[PDB]
Amino acid sequence: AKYDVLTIGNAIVDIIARCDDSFLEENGIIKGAMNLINADRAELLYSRMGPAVEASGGSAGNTAAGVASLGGRAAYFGKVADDQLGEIFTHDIRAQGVHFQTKPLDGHPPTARSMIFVTEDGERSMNTYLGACVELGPEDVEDDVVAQSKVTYFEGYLWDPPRAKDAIREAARIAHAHGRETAMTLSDSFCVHRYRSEFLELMRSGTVDIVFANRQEALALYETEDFDRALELLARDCKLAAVTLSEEGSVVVRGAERVRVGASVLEQVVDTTGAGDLYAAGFLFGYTSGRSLEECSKLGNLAAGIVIGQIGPRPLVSLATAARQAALVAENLYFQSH
Amino acid sequence: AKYDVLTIGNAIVDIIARCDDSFLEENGIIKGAMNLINADRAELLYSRMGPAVEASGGSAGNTAAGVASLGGRAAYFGKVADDQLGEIFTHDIRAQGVHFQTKPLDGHPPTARSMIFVTEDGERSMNTYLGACVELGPEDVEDDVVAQSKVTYFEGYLWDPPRAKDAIREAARIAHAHGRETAMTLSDSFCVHRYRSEFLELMRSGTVDIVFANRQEALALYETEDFDRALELLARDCKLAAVTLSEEGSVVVRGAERVRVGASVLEQVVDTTGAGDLYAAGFLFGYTSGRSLEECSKLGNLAAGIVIGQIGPRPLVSLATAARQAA
Ligand SMILES: Nc1ncnc2c1ncn2[C@@H]1O[C@H](COP(=O)(O)OP(=O)(O)O)[C@@H](O)[C@H]1O
């Protein structure tokens, strides 16, 4: 094995700015959700937006910058164009130390982008134009790479493009056949409605081993307001399934075993963007260096919470080095012994 | 008059990331300085650089956004390309409410970009590739706009590209011909060595009324370690000049007059990039709505301070708000 984690997901650059509640209703944007938009809507939304800040995103791409940051070894397959947006995206995931070799488009569509509006509550509302991401398919599976990677992890978000599901059946095959595990995030609670069924059967066929989701996503995957009930069904359909509970932290599920680890207490909720992504990043960093579900959920919340103190979805410095070093400096500020 | 401040400057997109000191010196990057680099040095540095975040920059660009955020009317001249970086630069400065109409390049060179390496002390070391910026010249001056703008502010950083200074001699001329005032920033201590003489002439000719500078730069301008000496000469070469002094604040100079104002005291110095630029924004916003020198200095320090507690060279927050909230 050469990689702990491989992620496959929509390669997306994030253009982010603050706005208020009325902005989102005035523009018919769904608060909290990922809104899918054509290129004309990306241009229109952009023009109505305040000055923004741009940062590499992509749900799966974040989770791989995550693992690399935590200390792990990671690799990523994404769809980007031969343009300035893609050249940045490329560099950003590489400078994490992730393996990124996927071939870029060469003209239109241009690199995918997402108009991310953060409200005062740290909630984030996304409006994503897929660009280059629709061209992602089976041709883009690096073969050797899926085989050398302990987990393979990929977005529900990948159902939207046309032929990403076929780059997926395929990496699920390659990876299982090499004694490896497959993982997914449910992405968003509307993705969940738009592919309830594709998602389930994709679990039941034991194509996907591990399932990450937030509470709404889980409630909605089994069309229900009963959360306990939903925890059972989710246990039946995969080996392993982690569920984010925002501030409550997490509840991992394995048959009737339910590891509830709680979440840090945060200074401010600045920008929620990137949380679930970094929860899973930490968790899998734990999981692929053999660690308890207990110490896994912990690595989860720890990583989530750091990224929520930030305009942006990705740690711009090694969490390995920072989290340790923070911890040392508090100790010595509190005049405590190590 | 229609605009309070017009700035003219190297239009640049900042690419920003952390590094340590050792990194700067393995790459022969002068710390705290602005380092010019060809396209090939850009690709190379970029690859050696950690994950970055990106934001509209440009010394004059920031200053113009600054004036708008505070509530003033601003405009900007600078050269971008018809590419994705140019499109962002364009959006950000327009979304501040700044007037920007300068026509982009179409093709090569591409939109300028500066790789800004921030060390732990929040000093910032910049490696800028001018790209589309060399294409800036007299043809890019909007005559009516310069005549309509109470102050016309421009970077000393514009003596690096070939024909920028010509656009400049033109705009100073249009401005004085309409009863307006021109200002400039000395930009970088090294920029100062590179043009020590042009700059002084710019002043003594009365082309530049007002001068903005930090401490190191004021000294370079007169090659002297005597700071008061440096201040005396500066009062002789221009109508008015403001010198920022980091944590000490600013001192402003007008003949024999010396208005010193302290900096706000800060919680965190995160990223020092943009400080000299927002200082001038605050100062010129106060200056162009008829405020005393003291109040100009306060507004300058307020805005410098807010931006230094932030990754990115332009404040995320509404400055008109922070100015009102501080009374
Ligand atoms: N309000 C909060 N306070 C502290 N940590 C939080 C908070 N919200 C989210 N997190 C962290 O990031 C993860 C994901 O948050 P969650 O609400 O489950 O939804 P999502 O996947 O939509 O971002 C958490 O499980 C946790 O570690």
Ligand SMILES: Nc1ncnc2c1ncn2[C@@H]1O[C@H](COP(=O)(O)OP(=O)(O)O)[C@@H](O)[C@H]1O
């Ligand atoms: N350490 C600091 N604490 C509070 N304010 C500061 C600090 N450093 C700079 N400033 C603010 O930014 C302005 C620019 O400071 P200076 O270091 O002289 O700028 P430059 O970035 O042009 O070298 C100051 O006049 C001040 O208001």
Ligand SMILES: Nc1ncnc2c1ncn2[C@@H]1O[C@H](CO)[C@@H](O)[C@H]1O
């Ligand atoms: N349709 C999408 N597919 C994959 N990632 C997305 C999509 N829409 C938004 N994102 C990513 O979601 C992240 C956090 O959940 C962001 O950084 C952003 O890039």
Ligand SMILES: Nc1ncnc2c1ncn2[C@@H]1O[C@H](CO)[C@@H](O)[C@H]1O
């Ligand atoms: N050669 C240059 N001319 C004008 N502004 C620059 C130059 N290089 C970097 N900058 C900008 O200087 C700022 C603060 O001084 C940053 O936003 C950065 O983009």
